[PDB]
Amino acid sequence: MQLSWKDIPTVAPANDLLDIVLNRTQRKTPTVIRPGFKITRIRAFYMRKVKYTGEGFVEKFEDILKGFPNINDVHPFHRDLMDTLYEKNHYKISLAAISRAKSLVEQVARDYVRLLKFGQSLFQCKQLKRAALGRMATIVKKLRDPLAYLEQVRQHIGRLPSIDPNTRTLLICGYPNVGKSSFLRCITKSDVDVQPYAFTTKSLYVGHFDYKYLRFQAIDTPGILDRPTEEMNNIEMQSIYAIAHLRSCVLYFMDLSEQCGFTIEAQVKLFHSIKPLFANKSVMVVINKTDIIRPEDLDEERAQLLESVKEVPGVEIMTSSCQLEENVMEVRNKACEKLLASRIENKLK
């Protein structure tokens, strides 16, 4: 796919756009007309004025409408991401407002040129020219709010990363601070930042690595909270929709010190709730901060949860420490090998 929309031309607010188009007309077209000229020449002057302004408005609007992604016919993962970041119906209606403004300007230009066809004096021709430009200015000024909104959308979507859904992606999730940031910065050269509080990074992060001459990518989630989730804020809905739409080996992280503040019981409950979300995906569970305690010598109370999630198929369990480069590479190797096995079955298909 396009996978990127940084190539959207910058959007100008109503007043700046008005200045740009009207000043371009006043500079790029002749400005001296005389009452003593022929009426036909006067009409040509003012018709050229109206037509040029209409062309400028519609070309700026055409740039706007062609730049922004069609969120309807776009890939479903990108569609859900765009919806979560900026409300889809709001986005669609702002674009539709742009389209209506384009149509209205084009129609007014044609109509006032048609009226100028019968100009009877320089005064009347000037009046018609001013009327046409004033109507266009009124349209643009009514178009104010969509321009500011789409400017913000343009900046943010240009700053969004480039995640291809049809790649070998390794998705990484769990609570904040568990070691997702360290794991990503270890397996890849991704520049995320780690802090001791929740939702430290409010967006998805991407990185890349190679394994057996194949370019794999790795995605790090903002973090998820365990609730009924009937209503949720966009920060974690991004992670939810990524897990849903990314064909990946979900590598869920766990803690035994409860450094994020949540219970291991809450982590197990969240994993049990998300288990039905996992369709034809091989899942691993890595336990971090295990230099203090491990499932091998942990209490049986949590071992009940451990045997329950072992009962849960077909996820697999591992404990790892970020400092051990060999251990983190073995985690990566297991995930990449199971992705390879899935794709080898698909090639048998």
């Binding site: 849903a244 739409h245 709730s273 979300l277 369709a279």
Partner: peptide, 9 residues
């Protein structure tokens, strides 16, 4: 719910 969502994917 979640199953409906992933089905809609």
């Amino acid at each position: 719910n979640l199953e409906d969502l992933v089905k809609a994917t």
